[PDB]
Design a protein around this ligand. Structure first.
Ligand code: HG
Ligand code: HG
Ligand code: HG
Ligand code: HG
Ligand code: HG
Length: 410
Protein backbone atom coordinates (compact mmCIF):
# COMPACT_ATOMS: atom_id res chain seq x y z
CA UNK A 1 0.00 0.00 0.00
CA UNK A 2 0.94 3.69 -0.05
CA UNK A 3 0.86 5.65 3.22
CA UNK A 4 -0.66 9.16 3.65
CA UNK A 5 1.81 11.96 2.97
CA UNK A 6 -0.45 14.54 4.66
CA UNK A 7 -2.04 14.33 8.11
CA UNK A 8 -5.21 16.30 8.97
CA UNK A 9 -4.43 18.23 12.15
CA UNK A 10 -7.19 20.79 12.53
CA UNK A 11 -10.69 21.48 11.22
CA UNK A 12 -12.80 24.65 11.28
CA UNK A 13 -16.32 24.58 9.91
CA UNK A 14 -18.28 27.76 9.32
CA UNK A 15 -21.83 26.64 8.69
CA UNK A 16 -25.06 28.37 7.78
CA UNK A 17 -28.02 27.54 10.02
CA UNK A 18 -30.39 24.79 8.91
CA UNK A 19 -33.66 25.15 7.01
CA UNK A 20 -35.97 27.53 8.84
CA UNK A 21 -39.45 29.00 8.43
CA UNK A 22 -39.64 32.18 6.33
CA UNK A 23 -38.38 34.89 8.69
CA UNK A 24 -41.25 37.14 7.57
CA UNK A 25 -44.83 37.30 6.25
CA UNK A 26 -45.32 40.94 5.23
CA UNK A 27 -48.19 42.61 3.35
CA UNK A 28 -46.06 43.28 0.26
CA UNK A 29 -45.65 39.53 -0.04
CA UNK A 30 -49.37 38.84 -0.23
CA UNK A 31 -49.87 41.71 -2.68
CA UNK A 32 -47.54 40.24 -5.35
CA UNK A 33 -49.35 36.93 -5.48
CA UNK A 34 -53.11 36.25 -5.51
CA UNK A 35 -52.36 32.85 -3.98
CA UNK A 36 -52.07 31.93 -0.30
CA UNK A 37 -48.63 31.27 1.19
CA UNK A 38 -48.36 27.82 2.85
CA UNK A 39 -48.01 27.81 6.64
CA UNK A 40 -45.01 26.27 8.41
CA UNK A 41 -44.78 24.02 11.53
CA UNK A 42 -42.46 26.21 13.62
CA UNK A 43 -42.27 29.95 14.26
CA UNK A 44 -40.72 32.17 11.61
CA UNK A 45 -36.93 32.24 11.53
CA UNK A 46 -36.81 29.11 13.70
CA UNK A 47 -35.09 25.85 12.75
CA UNK A 48 -37.47 23.04 11.82
CA UNK A 49 -37.00 19.45 13.03
CA UNK A 50 -36.45 18.50 9.39
CA UNK A 51 -33.84 21.27 9.33
CA UNK A 52 -32.19 19.84 12.41
CA UNK A 53 -32.20 16.34 10.94
CA UNK A 54 -30.61 17.59 7.73
CA UNK A 55 -27.90 19.28 9.80
CA UNK A 56 -27.44 16.15 11.94
CA UNK A 57 -26.93 14.18 8.73
CA UNK A 58 -23.99 16.45 7.89
CA UNK A 59 -22.71 15.79 11.37
CA UNK A 60 -22.93 11.99 11.00
CA UNK A 61 -20.94 12.37 7.80
CA UNK A 62 -18.21 14.68 9.18
CA UNK A 63 -17.72 12.25 12.02
CA UNK A 64 -17.20 9.42 9.52
CA UNK A 65 -14.96 11.56 7.33
CA UNK A 66 -12.85 12.84 10.24
CA UNK A 67 -12.47 9.30 11.59
CA UNK A 68 -11.29 8.06 8.20
CA UNK A 69 -8.84 10.96 8.43
CA UNK A 70 -7.90 9.96 11.95
CA UNK A 71 -8.52 13.30 13.66
CA UNK A 72 -11.47 11.84 15.60
CA UNK A 73 -11.77 8.42 17.29
CA UNK A 74 -14.16 5.97 15.63
CA UNK A 75 -15.95 5.24 18.90
CA UNK A 76 -17.08 6.98 22.08
CA UNK A 77 -17.46 10.68 22.82
CA UNK A 78 -14.63 12.88 21.60
CA UNK A 79 -12.11 13.84 24.29
CA UNK A 80 -12.90 16.85 26.45
CA UNK A 81 -11.85 19.91 24.48
CA UNK A 82 -11.39 18.07 21.19
CA UNK A 83 -14.54 19.43 19.56
CA UNK A 84 -15.76 23.00 20.18
CA UNK A 85 -19.09 24.38 18.94
CA UNK A 86 -19.91 28.09 18.71
CA UNK A 87 -23.19 29.67 17.66
CA UNK A 88 -24.64 33.12 16.93
CA UNK A 89 -27.24 34.04 19.57
CA UNK A 90 -30.25 33.27 17.33
CA UNK A 91 -32.48 30.26 17.97
CA UNK A 92 -31.84 28.88 14.49
CA UNK A 93 -28.02 28.98 14.81
CA UNK A 94 -27.95 27.66 18.34
CA UNK A 95 -30.05 24.62 17.33
CA UNK A 96 -27.93 24.07 14.24
CA UNK A 97 -25.07 23.73 16.68
CA UNK A 98 -26.96 21.13 18.69
CA UNK A 99 -28.22 19.30 15.58
CA UNK A 100 -24.62 19.06 14.35
CA UNK A 101 -23.30 17.83 17.70
CA UNK A 102 -26.06 15.23 17.98
CA UNK A 103 -25.10 13.87 14.57
CA UNK A 104 -21.35 14.08 15.13
CA UNK A 105 -21.46 12.42 18.55
CA UNK A 106 -24.98 11.30 19.52
CA UNK A 107 -25.86 10.96 23.20
CA UNK A 108 -22.66 12.91 23.90
CA UNK A 109 -22.93 16.14 25.83
CA UNK A 110 -21.16 18.58 23.54
CA UNK A 111 -22.24 22.03 24.65
CA UNK A 112 -22.98 24.77 22.13
CA UNK A 113 -21.23 27.98 23.15
CA UNK A 114 -22.77 31.39 22.51
CA UNK A 115 -22.40 34.98 23.62
CA UNK A 116 -23.57 35.10 27.26
CA UNK A 117 -26.02 37.89 26.53
CA UNK A 118 -28.44 36.20 24.14
CA UNK A 119 -30.79 39.20 23.91
CA UNK A 120 -28.08 41.26 22.19
CA UNK A 121 -26.30 40.77 18.82
CA UNK A 122 -22.95 38.98 18.82
CA UNK A 123 -20.30 41.14 17.14
CA UNK A 124 -18.47 38.01 16.01
CA UNK A 125 -21.17 37.50 13.42
CA UNK A 126 -21.35 41.16 12.31
CA UNK A 127 -19.11 43.84 13.86
CA UNK A 128 -20.99 46.59 12.00
CA UNK A 129 -24.44 46.25 13.55
CA UNK A 130 -23.02 46.52 17.07
CA UNK A 131 -20.85 49.50 16.19
CA UNK A 132 -17.50 47.70 16.51
CA UNK A 133 -16.66 49.41 13.23
CA UNK A 134 -18.28 51.31 10.37
CA UNK A 135 -18.46 51.23 6.60
CA UNK A 136 -17.06 54.10 4.52
CA UNK A 137 -20.30 55.17 2.80
CA UNK A 138 -18.93 56.75 -0.37
CA UNK A 139 -16.38 53.99 -0.99
CA UNK A 140 -19.00 51.29 -0.38
CA UNK A 141 -21.57 53.06 -2.56
CA UNK A 142 -19.11 53.17 -5.48
CA UNK A 143 -17.88 49.61 -4.95
CA UNK A 144 -21.44 48.16 -4.99
CA UNK A 145 -22.66 50.25 -7.93
CA UNK A 146 -19.41 49.40 -9.70
CA UNK A 147 -20.23 45.72 -9.21
CA UNK A 148 -23.73 46.43 -10.59
CA UNK A 149 -22.39 47.62 -13.92
CA UNK A 150 -22.96 51.22 -12.85
CA UNK A 151 -26.62 51.11 -11.83
CA UNK A 152 -29.11 48.84 -10.14
CA UNK A 153 -31.44 49.25 -13.13
CA UNK A 154 -28.89 47.73 -15.45
CA UNK A 155 -28.20 45.01 -12.87
CA UNK A 156 -31.87 44.02 -12.72
CA UNK A 157 -32.18 44.77 -16.41
CA UNK A 158 -29.84 41.85 -17.03
CA UNK A 159 -31.80 39.46 -14.86
CA UNK A 160 -35.32 40.16 -16.12
CA UNK A 161 -35.51 36.61 -17.40
CA UNK A 162 -35.27 35.47 -13.77
CA UNK A 163 -37.64 38.22 -12.53
CA UNK A 164 -40.18 37.16 -15.15
CA UNK A 165 -39.83 33.54 -14.09
CA UNK A 166 -40.58 34.63 -10.52
CA UNK A 167 -43.58 36.69 -11.66
CA UNK A 168 -44.74 33.54 -13.44
CA UNK A 169 -44.52 31.48 -10.23
CA UNK A 170 -46.40 34.16 -8.25
CA UNK A 171 -48.96 34.72 -11.06
CA UNK A 172 -47.97 38.29 -10.44
CA UNK A 173 -50.15 39.58 -13.32
CA UNK A 174 -53.32 38.75 -11.36
CA UNK A 175 -51.87 40.03 -8.08
CA UNK A 176 -53.31 42.83 -5.99
CA UNK A 177 -50.21 44.97 -6.52
CA UNK A 178 -50.57 44.51 -10.27
CA UNK A 179 -54.39 44.82 -10.31
CA UNK A 180 -54.45 48.08 -8.32
CA UNK A 181 -51.69 49.31 -10.60
CA UNK A 182 -52.08 53.08 -10.88
CA UNK A 183 -50.23 53.07 -14.21
CA UNK A 184 -51.99 50.18 -15.95
CA UNK A 185 -50.86 51.77 -19.21
CA UNK A 186 -47.55 49.91 -18.98
CA UNK A 187 -47.31 46.14 -18.43
CA UNK A 188 -46.92 44.67 -14.91
CA UNK A 189 -43.37 44.05 -13.66
CA UNK A 190 -41.76 43.57 -10.24
CA UNK A 191 -38.69 45.65 -11.11
CA UNK A 192 -40.92 48.49 -12.32
CA UNK A 193 -43.54 48.47 -9.54
CA UNK A 194 -40.83 48.25 -6.88
CA UNK A 195 -37.77 50.26 -7.88
CA UNK A 196 -34.64 49.04 -6.06
CA UNK A 197 -32.59 51.74 -4.33
CA UNK A 198 -29.14 51.27 -2.81
CA UNK A 199 -29.01 52.41 0.81
CA UNK A 200 -25.63 52.69 2.53
CA UNK A 201 -25.15 53.66 6.20
CA UNK A 202 -22.25 53.19 8.64
CA UNK A 203 -23.55 49.93 10.09
CA UNK A 204 -25.65 48.66 7.21
CA UNK A 205 -26.21 48.18 3.49
CA UNK A 206 -29.58 47.46 1.87
CA UNK A 207 -31.27 47.22 -1.53
CA UNK A 208 -34.97 48.02 -1.37
CA UNK A 209 -37.47 46.99 -4.01
CA UNK A 210 -37.70 43.90 -6.15
CA UNK A 211 -34.05 43.00 -5.71
CA UNK A 212 -34.49 42.26 -2.01
CA UNK A 213 -38.07 40.97 -2.34
CA UNK A 214 -37.13 38.45 -5.03
CA UNK A 215 -34.13 37.30 -3.02
CA UNK A 216 -36.49 36.56 -0.14
CA UNK A 217 -39.28 35.08 -2.28
CA UNK A 218 -37.02 32.75 -4.25
CA UNK A 219 -35.26 31.58 -1.08
CA UNK A 220 -38.64 30.70 0.46
CA UNK A 221 -39.48 28.58 -2.59
CA UNK A 222 -36.17 26.83 -1.85
CA UNK A 223 -37.04 26.46 1.83
CA UNK A 224 -40.41 24.88 0.96
CA UNK A 225 -38.59 22.43 -1.33
CA UNK A 226 -35.89 21.54 1.22
CA UNK A 227 -38.65 21.15 3.83
CA UNK A 228 -40.51 18.70 1.59
CA UNK A 229 -43.71 20.72 1.31
CA UNK A 230 -46.21 19.32 -1.28
CA UNK A 231 -45.79 21.79 -4.14
CA UNK A 232 -43.22 24.59 -3.61
CA UNK A 233 -44.35 27.80 -5.27
CA UNK A 234 -47.78 26.26 -5.79
CA UNK A 235 -46.55 23.48 -8.09
CA UNK A 236 -45.28 26.04 -10.61
CA UNK A 237 -41.59 25.15 -10.24
CA UNK A 238 -41.17 21.98 -12.26
CA UNK A 239 -37.53 21.58 -13.29
CA UNK A 240 -33.89 22.22 -12.33
CA UNK A 241 -33.41 25.13 -14.74
CA UNK A 242 -36.34 26.96 -13.11
CA UNK A 243 -34.90 26.38 -9.67
CA UNK A 244 -31.56 27.88 -10.72
CA UNK A 245 -33.17 30.81 -12.51
CA UNK A 246 -35.26 31.62 -9.48
CA UNK A 247 -32.53 31.38 -6.87
CA UNK A 248 -30.19 33.37 -9.09
CA UNK A 249 -32.05 36.47 -7.80
CA UNK A 250 -31.13 35.34 -4.32
CA UNK A 251 -27.45 34.92 -5.19
CA UNK A 252 -27.50 38.27 -7.00
CA UNK A 253 -28.51 40.24 -3.96
CA UNK A 254 -25.69 38.62 -1.98
CA UNK A 255 -23.14 39.14 -4.75
CA UNK A 256 -23.80 42.86 -4.34
CA UNK A 257 -24.48 43.41 -0.66
CA UNK A 258 -22.47 40.63 1.01
CA UNK A 259 -19.55 39.67 -1.25
CA UNK A 260 -18.43 43.16 -2.20
CA UNK A 261 -14.96 43.46 -0.61
CA UNK A 262 -15.75 46.90 0.85
CA UNK A 263 -18.48 45.26 2.91
CA UNK A 264 -17.20 41.68 3.20
CA UNK A 265 -13.76 42.54 4.61
CA UNK A 266 -15.12 44.52 7.55
CA UNK A 267 -18.09 42.24 8.20
CA UNK A 268 -15.90 39.10 7.98
CA UNK A 269 -12.94 40.33 10.12
CA UNK A 270 -14.02 38.90 13.47
CA UNK A 271 -14.43 35.43 11.89
CA UNK A 272 -11.26 35.69 9.84
CA UNK A 273 -9.36 36.33 13.10
CA UNK A 274 -11.03 33.38 14.87
CA UNK A 275 -10.47 31.04 11.96
CA UNK A 276 -6.82 32.01 11.64
CA UNK A 277 -6.16 31.58 15.36
CA UNK A 278 -8.03 28.30 15.42
CA UNK A 279 -6.11 27.01 12.40
CA UNK A 280 -2.74 28.18 13.67
CA UNK A 281 -0.89 25.85 16.05
CA UNK A 282 -0.19 27.16 19.56
CA UNK A 283 -0.80 26.46 23.28
CA UNK A 284 -4.49 25.56 23.95
CA UNK A 285 -6.27 28.04 26.24
CA UNK A 286 -9.76 29.07 27.38
CA UNK A 287 -10.44 31.96 25.06
CA UNK A 288 -13.52 33.76 23.68
CA UNK A 289 -16.72 31.88 24.59
CA UNK A 290 -14.99 29.89 27.33
CA UNK A 291 -13.66 27.58 24.62
CA UNK A 292 -10.11 26.24 24.28
CA UNK A 293 -8.09 26.83 21.10
CA UNK A 294 -6.28 25.30 19.45
CA UNK A 295 -8.02 21.93 19.58
CA UNK A 296 -9.07 19.61 16.70
CA UNK A 297 -12.51 20.49 15.35
CA UNK A 298 -14.27 23.86 15.65
CA UNK A 299 -17.80 24.20 14.31
CA UNK A 300 -19.29 27.67 13.92
CA UNK A 301 -23.04 28.12 13.35
CA UNK A 302 -23.54 31.29 11.38
CA UNK A 303 -25.50 32.67 8.45
CA UNK A 304 -25.41 32.90 4.68
CA UNK A 305 -24.18 36.48 5.05
CA UNK A 306 -21.10 35.16 6.93
CA UNK A 307 -20.10 32.57 4.32
CA UNK A 308 -20.65 35.15 1.59
CA UNK A 309 -18.55 37.72 3.49
CA UNK A 310 -15.74 35.19 3.95
CA UNK A 311 -15.96 34.26 0.30
CA UNK A 312 -15.72 37.91 -0.66
CA UNK A 313 -12.85 38.66 1.73
CA UNK A 314 -10.81 35.56 0.86
CA UNK A 315 -11.62 35.88 -2.83
CA UNK A 316 -13.25 32.42 -2.94
CA UNK A 317 -15.80 31.85 -5.73
CA UNK A 318 -17.92 28.77 -6.21
CA UNK A 319 -20.98 27.21 -7.87
CA UNK A 320 -22.60 24.17 -6.23
CA UNK A 321 -23.73 21.49 -8.74
CA UNK A 322 -27.25 20.42 -7.78
CA UNK A 323 -27.74 23.33 -5.38
CA UNK A 324 -29.07 26.65 -6.78
CA UNK A 325 -28.33 28.51 -3.52
CA UNK A 326 -24.71 29.69 -3.35
CA UNK A 327 -24.70 29.47 0.49
CA UNK A 328 -27.66 27.12 1.29
CA UNK A 329 -28.97 26.23 4.75
CA UNK A 330 -26.57 23.71 6.26
CA UNK A 331 -23.90 24.72 3.76
CA UNK A 332 -20.39 24.59 5.26
CA UNK A 333 -17.23 26.55 4.43
CA UNK A 334 -14.51 24.16 5.58
CA UNK A 335 -10.96 25.09 6.52
CA UNK A 336 -8.46 22.32 7.22
CA UNK A 337 -4.82 22.34 8.26
CA UNK A 338 -2.78 19.40 7.04
CA UNK A 339 0.82 18.78 8.01
CA UNK A 340 3.14 17.38 5.34
CA UNK A 341 4.88 14.42 7.00
CA UNK A 342 7.94 14.85 4.78
CA UNK A 343 9.17 18.09 6.37
CA UNK A 344 6.32 18.73 8.82
CA UNK A 345 5.34 21.92 7.00
CA UNK A 346 1.82 23.28 7.59
CA UNK A 347 -0.83 23.58 4.88
CA UNK A 348 -4.46 24.63 4.65
CA UNK A 349 -7.37 23.50 2.50
CA UNK A 350 -10.69 25.22 1.94
CA UNK A 351 -13.84 23.67 0.49
CA UNK A 352 -17.60 24.10 0.51
CA UNK A 353 -19.63 21.15 1.78
CA UNK A 354 -23.35 21.19 0.99
CA UNK A 355 -26.44 19.06 0.44
CA UNK A 356 -27.82 19.23 -3.10
CA UNK A 357 -31.38 20.52 -3.23
CA UNK A 358 -32.54 16.94 -3.91
CA UNK A 359 -30.63 15.56 -0.91
CA UNK A 360 -32.66 17.96 1.22
CA UNK A 361 -35.91 17.29 -0.58
CA UNK A 362 -35.68 13.53 0.08
CA UNK A 363 -33.91 14.03 3.39
CA UNK A 364 -31.29 11.52 2.24
CA UNK A 365 -28.91 10.24 4.99
CA UNK A 366 -25.24 10.99 4.41
CA UNK A 367 -22.08 8.95 4.95
CA UNK A 368 -18.91 8.11 3.03
CA UNK A 369 -20.94 6.02 0.57
CA UNK A 370 -23.63 8.66 0.09
CA UNK A 371 -21.72 11.93 0.66
CA UNK A 372 -22.97 15.52 0.47
CA UNK A 373 -21.68 17.64 -2.38
CA UNK A 374 -18.20 19.07 -2.03
CA UNK A 375 -16.21 21.64 -3.99
CA UNK A 376 -12.51 22.10 -3.30
CA UNK A 377 -11.77 25.82 -3.14
CA UNK A 378 -8.75 27.73 -4.35
CA UNK A 379 -7.42 30.90 -2.76
CA UNK A 380 -6.93 33.18 -5.77
CA UNK A 381 -4.48 35.20 -3.72
CA UNK A 382 -2.26 32.26 -2.74
CA UNK A 383 1.12 31.68 -4.39
CA UNK A 384 2.89 29.12 -2.21
CA UNK A 385 1.15 25.75 -2.58
CA UNK A 386 1.84 22.04 -2.22
CA UNK A 387 1.40 19.07 -4.54
CA UNK A 388 -2.16 18.77 -3.21
CA UNK A 389 -3.09 22.28 -4.33
CA UNK A 390 -3.42 23.62 -0.77
CA UNK A 391 -2.08 26.95 0.44
CA UNK A 392 0.78 27.09 2.95
CA UNK A 393 0.02 28.25 6.49
CA UNK A 394 2.17 31.33 5.87
CA UNK A 395 0.42 32.13 2.61
CA UNK A 396 -3.05 31.77 4.11
CA UNK A 397 -1.99 33.73 7.18
CA UNK A 398 -0.85 36.48 4.83
CA UNK A 399 -4.08 36.37 2.84
CA UNK A 400 -6.02 36.70 6.11
CA UNK A 401 -3.95 39.57 7.54
CA UNK A 402 -4.21 41.62 4.32
CA UNK A 403 -7.94 41.06 3.93
CA UNK A 404 -8.94 41.83 7.52
CA UNK A 405 -9.81 45.34 8.69
CA UNK A 406 -7.92 45.99 11.97
CA UNK A 407 -10.62 48.44 13.04
CA UNK A 408 -13.21 45.63 13.01
CA UNK A 409 -11.34 43.07 15.11
CA UNK A 410 -13.12 42.19 18.38
HG1 HG B 1 -19.54 28.40 27.01
HG1 HG C 1 -5.73 30.35 21.57
HG1 HG D 1 -7.70 24.84 17.00
HG1 HG E 1 -9.99 23.65 15.23
HG1 HG F 1 -29.98 31.68 1.33
Amino acid sequence: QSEPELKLESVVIVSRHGVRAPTKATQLMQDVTPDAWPTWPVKLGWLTPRGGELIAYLGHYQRQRLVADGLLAKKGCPQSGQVAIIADVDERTRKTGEAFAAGLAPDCAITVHTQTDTSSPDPLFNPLKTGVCQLDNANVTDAILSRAGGSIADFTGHRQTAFRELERVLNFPQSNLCLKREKQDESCSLTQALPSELKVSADNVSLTGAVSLASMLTEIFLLQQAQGMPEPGWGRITDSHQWNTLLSLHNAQFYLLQRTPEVARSRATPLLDLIKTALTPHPPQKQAYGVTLPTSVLFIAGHDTNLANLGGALELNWTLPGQPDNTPPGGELVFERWRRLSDNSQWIQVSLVFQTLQQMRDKTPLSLNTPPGEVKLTLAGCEERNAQGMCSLAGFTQIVNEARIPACSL
